[PDB]
Every structure is written in C-alpha cells, then in structure tokens.
Design a protein around this ligand. Structure first.
Ligand SMILES: *C(N)[C@H](CCCNC(N)=O)NC(=O)C1(C(=O)N[C@H](C)c2ccsc2)CCC1
Length: 255
C-alpha cells in the first residue's frame, strides 16, 4: 500500500513551511521546533493550503512552562503538542523576520560548521512568556492562536510511522545524538563513531531508499548550512538511535 519513497514537500507543493529549515540558535529548544514545524505543515495540509503560516516556536518555548519541561534546558515533545490542544499557538517566523505574532527572539548561529554567523554556545536563558504580538502585526495575540484537536503518540513501528506521515503529514520525533552525527553532510546516517551527546528532537517528513539503504527524511533546526541544506537522512527500520521510539503528532482544529 505504501510507496517505496515519500517526500512531504512533493506531496503538498503549495505548503511552503514543509520545505523550510529553521535555526534554534543557542538554546535547547529542539523539542519546540520539531513541534511547531510539523504543526505548521499540518495546518496547511488540513486546509489544502488555504492557511499557510509559520507557527511560533517562541510562543511554545516561553509560555508552556513546567508541563513541557524547562524551556531552553530541554523539554517533552508529547506535552508540546498537548499545549497546542489546550492553549494554542500564535504565528511567528524567523529571528528579526517581523513575520507573525511572536517571531523567534534567539539569534541564529553556526552549529558545528564554519560560516559568517557567530558560533553556537550552550543553553542560553529561556525568554519570558509575553502574551502580546509584535508591533505592526494584526490581529491580536488571542485572535492569532491556532489550536489542535488532539495530540498522540505514534507506535514504534516503521509502517505505522510511514502511514501517519502519508495520511496526516510530517511528525515530530527524537533520537540519540552521537558525536559523528554532528559532522553529517550527506547520505544515510548510521552511527559508527563517537560518544553519546544527548537526545535531539526533529521533524520527520518522509522516507526513501538510497543505494539499498532505507532512510527517514528529516529536517534539523540547525540552519541551512548544516548537513544536507539543513536536512538529513537516517537509517529506517531498526529504531536506529531511537528514531522510531518517540514519534508524536496531532490533528489541527479548523481556525
Ligand atoms: C534539544 N536541543 C534539546 C537539547 C538541548 C541541549 N543543549 C546543549 N547545549 O547540549 N533536547 C531536548 O529537548 C530533549 C530532551 O533531552 N529533553 C529532556 C530529557 C527533558 C525532558 C523533560 S525536562 C528535560 C531531547 C528530545 C527532548
């Protein structure tokens, strides 16, 4: 039933957020980024491109509080999606973009690569929850909220995750980062060297096969000069680095 390859960017060509790579900056907010990116995609898919917006990482990062975790010091993706169902999320684009209600306040940086931006440092402070949109944006904060119908776990099964993406759009997942992952440029990632650095949340938007190796198509939040234009591929079908073990998703309410 499922195709040998699937790419959400090809399936939903009128949904620009699916193609977009963000930059979490010097802040451990991957849990938030994986969520708002997939939510942005799912709102566009759910409306057949009639509503296409960058959902605010700032809003999720700053305003969830204890139920999600500890802001820039890590969080729980499951409860990020739950926050979307309970209190909703406003719009917000990239740093100094002036796009949406609450654009990201933490500046971009170079994540384990050379480039013109400053080098990323450790976990910076979590910004305050400010329930007010930026100057120049309409409508108001309350009026700009987008809500989810539900949030749920996807089972630790390759085919179930594929089915979920195929039907309902990109999902959030998490995997264990080893030091060799940081150097990723292209191909299918499999862990071959290096120690455990910690967990990392990302957006899964498809799958395929390359030179006989099955993979998941993943968006990272380390800007576009990391990896393969901000994306990477990782081995699919063996719960590699736990990539199939913490997938989470949710369906939008209609605005
Ligand atoms: C994502 N960037 C974040 C790593 C931040 C570490 N920064 C750094 N300088 O090393 N990781 C996460 O958000 C996850 C996590 O580890 N959460 C922990 C277990 C947590 C859960 C509840 S409170 C803290 C990995 C996916 C979630």
């Amino acid at each position: 039933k499922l195709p040998a390859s699937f790419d959400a960017r090809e399936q939903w060509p009128q949904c620009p957020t699916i193609k977009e790579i963000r930059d979490q900056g010097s802040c451990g907010s991957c849990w938030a980024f994986g969520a708002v990116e997939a939510i942005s995609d799912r709102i566009c898919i759910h409306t057949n491109a009639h509503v296409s917006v960058e959902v605010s990482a700032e809003d999720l990062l700053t305003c969830c509080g204890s139920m999600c975790g500890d802001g820039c010091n890590g969080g729980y993706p499951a409860e990020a999606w739950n926050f979307w169902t309970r209190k909703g999320l406003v719009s917000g684009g990239l740093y100094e973009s002036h796009v949406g209600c609450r654009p990201y306040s933490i500046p971009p940086c170079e994540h384990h690569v050379n480039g013109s931006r400053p080098p990323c440092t450790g976990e910076g402070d979590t910004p305050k929850c400010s329930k007010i949109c930026e100057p120049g944006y309409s409508p108001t904060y309350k009026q700009d909220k987008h809500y989810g119908y539900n949030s749920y776990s996807v089972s630790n099964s390759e085919k179930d995750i594929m089915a979920e993406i195929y039907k309902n759009g990109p999902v959030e997942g998490a995997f264990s980062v080893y030091s060799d992952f940081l150097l990723y440029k292209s191909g299918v990632y499999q862990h071959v060297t290096g120690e455990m650095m910690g967990g990392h949340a990302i957006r899964i938007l498809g799958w395929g096969v390359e030179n006989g190796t099955p993979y998941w198509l993943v968006a990272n939040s380390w800007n576009t000069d990391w990896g393969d234009n901000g994306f990477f591929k990782i081995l699919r079908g063996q719960d590699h680095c736990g990539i199939e073990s913490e997938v989470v998703a949710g369906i939008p309410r209609t605005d």
